[PDB]
């Protein structure tokens, strides 16, 4: 049998993601910008 | 460190240096974006298109305070503060 | 003919107005219509270039047909807004 006679204290790093960026989208702004006609067409298209 | 202004620990300072977080802070005024049009900043471009990033509820200082409290608790009390009321114990005996 | 991608010297019977800057306006440059804020620009257009486009293909700059000045165009709408309410049944007062 092999028996250890000495020891070491090791310190190892474990990197763990916890959160990601919280984001929100102004659907009308992205799809239509500042166009009024596009905004009306988007309303007619349906609110997804 | 009680003396330094960071309020976080040294290792935490190094770790926050390692990662490049792009833009600092979550506030970008309309005047700022309009005054620096020549630099095609990505954040201005995505904010002008309706995409916004919301700040985390807990600030980095608050998270650092949580981490400092955890480290101090494990140093002074040890494992006993995870079950009931934190019980003080010398660090050498906790190691034993 | 081509319409909205190059300099033009043939134009419809329309009346020009004074150039308004740093204000949200409805603009029409050589037939290209839109809504935005106009500012002085540092871009240097070649003689054969009339419009400038960003990575999104949005027309972000234009040479003034009269003064030959280069103007940057920005969207009027910008900035995140959120509403805090205690509940409509409880009250109709909100914070923004
Ligand atoms: C286009 O013309 C304008 C206006 O200048 C002339 O005078 C006006 C009263 C009117 O009769 C116009 O049709 C004429 O062209 C020139 O505008 C210049 O720039 C400034 C800045 O806005 C303007 O206020 C001044 O009146 C003009 N400066 C002068 C005349 O010294 C403009 O330069 C002309 N552009 C081209 C490409 O010819």
UniProtKB/TrEMBL annotation, chain A:
Disulphide bridges, residue numbers: 32-38
Protein's recorded name: Spike protein S2
Species the sequence originates in: Bat SARS-like coronavirus WIV1
Organism phylogeny: Viruses, Riboviria, Orthornavirae, Pisuviricota, Pisoniviricetes
Region of the whole protein represented: 695 to 742 of 1256
Automatic annotation (TrEMBL), chain C:
Protein name listed in UniProt: Spike protein S1
Cystine connections: 24-76
Domain of life: Viruses
UniProt source species: Bat SARS-like coronavirus WIV1
Residues modified by glycosylation: 89
Organism phylogeny: Viruses, Riboviria, Orthornavirae, Pisuviricota, Pisoniviricetes
């Amino acid at each position: 049998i092999a028996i250890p006679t000495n020891f070491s204290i090791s310190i190892t790093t474990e990197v763990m993601p916890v959160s990601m960026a919280k984001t929100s989208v102004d659907c009308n702004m992205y799809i239509c910008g500042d166009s009024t006609e596009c905004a009306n067409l988007l309303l007619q298209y349906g609110s997804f | 460190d009680p003396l330094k202004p960071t309020k976080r620990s040294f290792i935490e300072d190094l770790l926050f240096n390692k990662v490049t977080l792009a833009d600092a802070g979550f506030m970008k005024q309309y005047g700022e974006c309009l005054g620096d049009i020549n630099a095609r900043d990505l954040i201005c471009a995505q904010k002008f298109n309706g995409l916004t990033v919301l700040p985390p509820l807990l600030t980095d200082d608050m998270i650092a305070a949580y981490t400092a409290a955890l480290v101090s608790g494990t140093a002074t009390a040890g494992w006993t503060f995870g079950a009931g009321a934190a019980l003080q114990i010398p660090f050498a005996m906790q190691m034993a | 003919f081509e319409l909205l991608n190059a300099p033009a010297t043939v134009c419809g019977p329309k009346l020009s107005t004074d150039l308004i800057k740093n204000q949200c306006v409805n603009f029409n440059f050589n037939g290209l219509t839109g809504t935005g804020v106009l500012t002085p620009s540092s871009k240097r257009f070649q003689p054969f270039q009339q419009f400038g486009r960003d990575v999104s293909d949005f027309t972000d700059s234009v040479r003034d047909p009269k003064t030959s000045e280069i103007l940057d165009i920005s969207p009027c709408s910008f900035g995140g807004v959120s509403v805090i309410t205690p509940g409509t049944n409880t009250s109709s007062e909100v914070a923004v």
